[PDB]
Structures are given as structure tokens and as C-alpha cells.
Amino acid sequence: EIKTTTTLHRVVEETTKPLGATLVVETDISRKDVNGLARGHLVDGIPLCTPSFYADIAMQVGQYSMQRLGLVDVSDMVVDKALVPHGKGPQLLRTTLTMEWPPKAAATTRSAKVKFATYFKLDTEHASCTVRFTSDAQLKSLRRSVSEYKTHIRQLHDGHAKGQFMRYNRKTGYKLMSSMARFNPDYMLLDYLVLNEAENEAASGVDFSLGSSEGTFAAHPAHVDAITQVAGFAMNANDNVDIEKQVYVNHGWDSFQIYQPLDNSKSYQVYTKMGQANDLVHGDVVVLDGEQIVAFFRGLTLRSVPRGALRVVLQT
Amino acid sequence: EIKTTTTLHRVVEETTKPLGATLVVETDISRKDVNGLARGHLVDGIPLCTPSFYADIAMQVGQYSMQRLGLVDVSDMVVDKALVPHGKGPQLLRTTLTMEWPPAAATTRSAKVKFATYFKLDTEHASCTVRFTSDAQLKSLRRSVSEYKTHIRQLHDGHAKGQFMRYNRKTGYKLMSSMARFNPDYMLLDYLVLNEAENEAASGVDFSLGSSEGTFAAHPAHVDAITQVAGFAMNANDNVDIEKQVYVNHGWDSFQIYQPLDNSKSYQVYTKMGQANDLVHGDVVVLDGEQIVAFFRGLTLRSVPRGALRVVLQT
Ligand SMILES: Cc1cc(CSCc2cc(CSCC(=O)NCCNC(=O)CCNC(=O)[C@H](O)C(C)(C)COP(=O)(O)O)no2)no1
Ligand SMILES: Cc1cc(CSCc2cc(CSCC(=O)NCCNC(=O)CCNC(=O)[C@H](O)C(C)(C)COP(=O)(O)O)no2)no1
């Protein structure tokens, strides 16, 4: 029996069969405990749900599906269409998980397809991902790289201390981005960020104590979004990116794994080196707690879009 | 008689009497050579004329009045109401200079100047007092050059140790972009080093970074770029939330220019603005290496609610 949370409200349909199974859950993003959280960013006055909102639900339905048959990877995340939480009556986000398997091999299953769509009935298809019941091989490799990530972080701080790189305090960083997007205060968790613009390379302290995070989640959408904001800032805070004309927006990612809880009283270190500018850039994002590996995005992908075209799409 | 320029288009009236004189000039800010320049900044999509636009005209009518009767100080500048250059047919900015004297005209060392748009009266925008001043301030400033250069060097030393922020041109304007977007011809701040704890800034302003075609006494983009250093030093503080409160131009006590503001040259600008009534003030010096180029004394900024600013402009 799957547990309901702030971001997963009820089971719509659940069906187990010979060559597969379906699980459909529903979240009313207008419900009072979640509607504030569902409004992660505001672009041209229009609220937007963040990809981390889907990722939280994906982790929940993946963890449940796995246990009914131990890391869940939220992989192949593709965000296709904006979700605008209007807060004017029910707004039903349905998450459909499907699995396939050959006879008597249900227990071997290591992935499931997940789709996110709003309904009234069908409203919009928003996003999709593949949850993977994955090995700890990546975690083991990341643990061997900790000293290397730490050295990259130390080198960024050394360069700032010599006047080489920019260091943004929290409020100044969000001010720099404010003509592009204004954040829900509960999402404004970047305490500082050191940016080497030449390599789109950033080290950031993210402090989850800086916001309110009441509810139950698998991975708090504000905590996970704050991790991806480091990569977004590294791109859009470059002196040669004119955010009046072109901006790097979320596109999705290849892989996302969490190895330790994202604790609302703690601060974490985040490091990324995003690739150089088709219209896509990608890179990895690691999250540390001192010497411990906390989480990792592999192939986080951002897309360069015209600022005005973004505005027209959202307003329509 | 008075020369016409990009920012001063014709004489409306010129009268002398035994105890004074009046000079009224007119500028159609919709004329095609000046309308672009008149649009200095955009706030919430609404174009605004900068105080430096008035200062340029004030220098012109002051220099003229004066030679007719040798530094002009544009002093006691008060900006009361926004001027929005709509670009939809004539928009006539009238500048009125008045002098008074006891029965003695050649002794006169100041004149009152008013700036108002007419259709006839539209809006009263600003006023100042032009002063025909001594070189005492210039000579005192020349003795302080090494002290100003030391303040600038200390800011650069602090940034090189990671203590102060240094903004490249485009990143500086990006930081301010939710408050105002600038006419590219006004985006002349090449870099700025900010000590936030004292609202203290040193900036390189490079007039070659914009286009400045026309004739002026003091190019309004060049003078506005000087004041932007002080505005940035206030609004770029980490504790100023420009979504709620912003420091806007208010005016100044005194402004003198000692050397041409050359559109091929870069200059050094230094200011230490006071700590946060709703007003802050400070001095702004402009250097060309070892030479004193210009000085604002008592440049005044006013803290206003960002949304109240929006409503006022929108109406
Ligand atoms: C300090 C600090 C750090 C940062 C982060 S850097 C600046 C920044 C801000 C944001 C948030 S706003 C962009 C965003 O992606 N938000 C959520 C994602 N939500 C969607 O809804 C898009 C996907 N949607 C689409 O609609 C389409 O693909 C679209 C409209 C982009 C184009 O479609 P097409 O043109 O092909 O028709 N991110 O980075 N800030 O401060
Ligand atoms: C690098 C780098 C540098 C910068 C720029 S520096 C930061 C900055 C930018 C601005 C520009 S916008 C504010 C401004 O003052 N613009 C012109 C002045 N023009 C008026 O029209 C006010 C007139 N004042 C009024 O109308 C009223 O007094 C009002 C409405 C403000 C108050 O209302 P009241 O209460 O009196 O009714 N400024 O600083 N960027 O990157």
C-alpha cells in the first residue's frame, strides 16, 4: 500500500497482470498544503511547477513499485510543457507508472515508464521519465571522486580570494536573475555561489534551513530544485548571456540519484561544470555533505530559448 | 546670441529690464536627432528623461547668460516630476532662466532655471540654480587627487583579496535590469568595484562604449553615466531588495565640469554614498588619470517603494 504525502494524494487505478502492471496516482496541486509549494518560480508573473515536483512523485511511485516487487534513479527526465498552478479549483496532476515483463519475471524488473499529465478531462501532457532500480556502482565511483570534487571546490574559492571569480551572496544572486524569474521564497536556498564564467563552473553552498519545507515527501521539491538552480545560474549569470534576449531553461536530465536525506536543517555543497554552448548544454551536478556524497545529477540538460518567445508561450 | 544644439532648439523669449532679465528656450524632445537621447532609461516599459538632460540645457543657458554679462555650476538641482518622452508629435520642453539684480547687472553670479513641458502647460519637471562660480573648489579638488586615487587603489586591492564585488559592464546592468533597462548609449559603465559596507564605489566609465552624435554643453549620456555609479552603489547592496525598494535620482547640491567629457575616452569615477528619512547623499568625483574632470557635491538619492514608483509612472 503506497503512502500518501504532500505531493501524492490518492491512487486512481492500480492493475497487476501477466506481462505488466499500471499504477495511476493523482495530486490536486490546488490542495492547500501543496499549492504554495507547486508554485516554484514566477516568470512574467506566471507561476510554474518545477521538474523537481515530478521527480519527487517519481521517486515515490518508483520506491513503492520496487518494494512491492536499493536506489531509485529518476532517469531520462523530459519536461515538454509548462504546468501553471492556477489555484482556482481542482487541478489534477496524474502520474502513470507502467511496467512490462515476460512471464514469471516480474521480480526481475529494473525500470518503469512514468508520465505526468494534468486532467480535468485530459488537460496537458507535461513530462515523462523512466525510474530505474539501479545498482550502487555509481555511488561507489562517486565516493572515490570526493577528494577530486573537493579540490575543484577549493580551487574556485582560491580563485575568488585572488579576485579571479565572482562570488554571489544569496540575495544578490537572486537579484541578478530577477528579470528572468522570481522564486518562491521557500526555493531561495542558494546561500552563496562562486562562478568561474570561463568554464560555466560553479561551487555553491545550499542551505535548506533558509526556507520553510513543511510536509511529507520523498525528495522535497524545493531542495532538489535548489540543486539544479546552481547549474542554471552558472549558465545565465555569464557576462555574455543577455537574459533580456536569451535564457537557459530547464530541459530535463539523464539521471538523478539521492544517497542521503535532504535535511531541512542542513547546508550542502554543490559543484557543477556545465558544457559550452545546437541549443542544448549539459553537465553533471554533485551534492556533498562534507566528505559524504549526497546526490548526483548526470547529464542535467539546459536549453537556450529566446526570452520573448518564452514569455509568449507562457502567456498564451 | 545663444547657439542652438541637439538639446536646445530655439529661443522663445528674451527680455531685459532694469532689475533683471528672462530667457526662455525650447526643445522639441520629439525631434528626430534628440528623441532617442531623451529616452535615457526604461522603467516598467516607460521611457524617462534623465536629470542630466536638464543639466546640459542649464549649462548652455548659464554659459550664454554669463558671457552676455569662468565655471558654471548647475546647483540646487531638484527633480520633481518624471518626463516621459512619448515620441508622438511635438513635446515641447521649455527652459526658463531668470536673473535679478539691484540697480549692477554685470555683478550677477546666479540665475534661477525652470524646466517644464508645454503642449499649453503640461507638467513642471525640475528646477536648478546656475552659479557663475570661483575656481576655489577646483583648486581644492586638485590637492585631493592623490587622496581620491588612494581610495580607488584600496578598492581594487580589496577586490584582489576577495573582499569587494567587481562588476563587469553587462553583469552590472543585468543586476539592475528588473529596476530599469538603459538606452544602450547610456550603458557606459565599463566596470565597478563596490565596497557594500560603505556604499563606496570606484568605476571606469568609458564613453567610447556608446554613440553620442550631436552638439551639447555636457552630453546627457556622459553625465548620467557619472551619476549611475552612485545609484548602483546604493541599489546593488545585498540588503536592498529592488523588488520592494529602490534608490532613485533626486537631484544634487552642486555640479561642475572642468574638462570636456570626450566621447573617445574613459574616466575614473569614485563615490562614497552616505548610510540610509528617505534620502542619502554623497560626493562623486571624476578623474582622467591625474586630472580633475568633474565633481558632484551632495548628489542626493531617494528611497521609494518599487511598486509605488510603478503606479506613478503608469498613470
Ligand atoms: C541564485 C539563482 C540561481 C538561479 C537559477 S538560474 C536562472 C534560472 C531561473 C530558472 C527558472 S525559470 C525557467 C524554468 O525552466 N523553470 C522551470 C521549468 N518549467 C517549465 O515549465 C519549462 C519547460 N517548458 C516549455 O514550455 C517549452 O519547452 C518552452 C516554452 C521553453 C519552449 O517551447 P518551444 O519553443 O519549443 O515551443 N531557470 O534558470 N536563479 O537564481
Ligand atoms: C553598472 C550599472 C549601473 C547601473 C545603473 S545605477 C542604479 C540606478 C538606475 C536608475 C535609473 S531609474 C530611477 C531614476 O531616478 N531615473 C531618472 C530620474 N527620472 C525621474 O523621472 C524621477 C522623478 N521622480 C518622481 O517622479 C517622484 O519623485 C517619484 C515618483 C519617484 C516619487 O513619487 P512621490 O512620492 O513624490 O509622489 N536609478 O538608479 N546599472 O548597471
UniProtKB/Swiss-Prot annotation, chain A:
User: Which residue numbers delimit the PKS/mFAS DH domain?
Assistant: 9-311
Q: What is the effect of changing residue 229 to A?
A: Abolishes catalytic activity
Q: Which domain of life is it from?
A: Eukaryota
Region N-terminal hotdog fold: which residues?
9-138
Catalytic residues identified in the record: 41 (proton acceptor), 225 (proton donor)
Region feature Product template (PT) domain, mapped onto this chain: 1-316
The UniProt induction remark is: Actively expressed at 27 degrees Celsius but not at all at a temperature higher than 35 degrees Celsius. Expression is repressed by curcumin.
Q: Where is this region: C-terminal hotdog fold?
A: 161-311
Question: How does gene deletion manifest?
Answer: Impairs the production of norsolorinic acid, as well as of the four major forms of aflatoxin: AFB1, AFB2, AFG1 and AFG2.
Per the record, what is the consequence of mutating residue 228 to A? 40% decrease in catalytic activity
What does the record give as the function of this protein?
Norsolorinic acid synthase; part of the gene cluster that mediates the biosynthesis of aflatoxins, a group of polyketide-derived furanocoumarins, and part of the most toxic and carcinogenic compounds among the known mycotoxins. The four major aflatoxins produced by A.parasiticus are aflatoxin B1 (AFB1), aflatoxin B2 (AFB2), aflatoxin G1 (AFG1) and aflatoxin G2 (AFG2).
Description of its domains: The domain architecture includes starter unit:ACP transacylase (SAT), beta-ketoacyl synthase (KS), malonyl-CoA:ACP transacylase (MAT), product template (PT), acyl-carrier domain (ACP), and thioesterase/Claisen cyclase (TE/CLC) domains. The SAT domain receives a C6-fatty acid starter unit and transfers it onto the ACP for chain elongation. The KS accepts the hexanoyl-ACP unit and subsequent malonate extender units are loaded onto the ACP from the MAT domain for chain extension to generate the linear poly-beta-keto ACP-bound intermediate.
Q: What is this protein called?
A: Norsolorinic acid synthase
Source organism of the structure: Aspergillus parasiticus (strain ATCC 56775 / NRRL 5862 / SRRC 143 / SU-1)
- Specify first residue, last residue and whole-protein length for the fragment: 1305 to 1636 of 2109
Swiss-Prot record, chain B:
Tell me the impact of changing residue 41 to A: Abolishes catalytic activity
Span list, region Product template (PT) domain:
1-315
Q: Disruption effect? A: Impairs the production of norsolorinic acid, as well as of the four major forms of aflatoxin: AFB1, AFB2, AFG1 and AFG2.
Instruction: Specify the inducers.
Output: Actively expressed at 27 degrees Celsius but not at all at a temperature higher than 35 degrees Celsius. Expression is repressed by curcumin.
The record's active-site residues are 41, 224
Effect seen on changing residue 235 to A? Abolishes catalytic activity
Outline the segment boundaries, as ranges, of region: C-terminal hotdog fold: 160-310
Q: Where is this region: N-terminal hotdog fold?
A: 9-137
What region holds the PKS/mFAS DH domain? 9-310
Recorded consequence of changing residue 228 to A? Abolishes catalytic activity
Its job: Norsolorinic acid synthase; part of the gene cluster that mediates the biosynthesis of aflatoxins, a group of polyketide-derived furanocoumarins, and part of the most toxic and carcinogenic compounds among the known mycotoxins. The four major aflatoxins produced by A.parasiticus are aflatoxin B1 (AFB1), aflatoxin B2 (AFB2), aflatoxin G1 (AFG1) and aflatoxin G2 (AFG2).
Q: What is known of its domains?
A: The domain architecture includes starter unit:ACP transacylase (SAT), beta-ketoacyl synthase (KS), malonyl-CoA:ACP transacylase (MAT), product template (PT), acyl-carrier domain (ACP), and thioesterase/Claisen cyclase (TE/CLC) domains. The SAT domain receives a C6-fatty acid starter unit and transfers it onto the ACP for chain elongation. The KS accepts the hexanoyl-ACP unit and subsequent malonate extender units are loaded onto the ACP from the MAT domain for chain extension to generate the linear poly-beta-keto ACP-bound intermediate.
Name of the protein in question = Norsolorinic acid synthase
Q: Which organism is it from?
A: Aspergillus parasiticus (strain ATCC 56775 / NRRL 5862 / SRRC 143 / SU-1)
Q: Source organism lineage? A: Eukaryota, Fungi, Dikarya, Ascomycota, Pezizomycotina
Gene this chain is encoded by: aflC
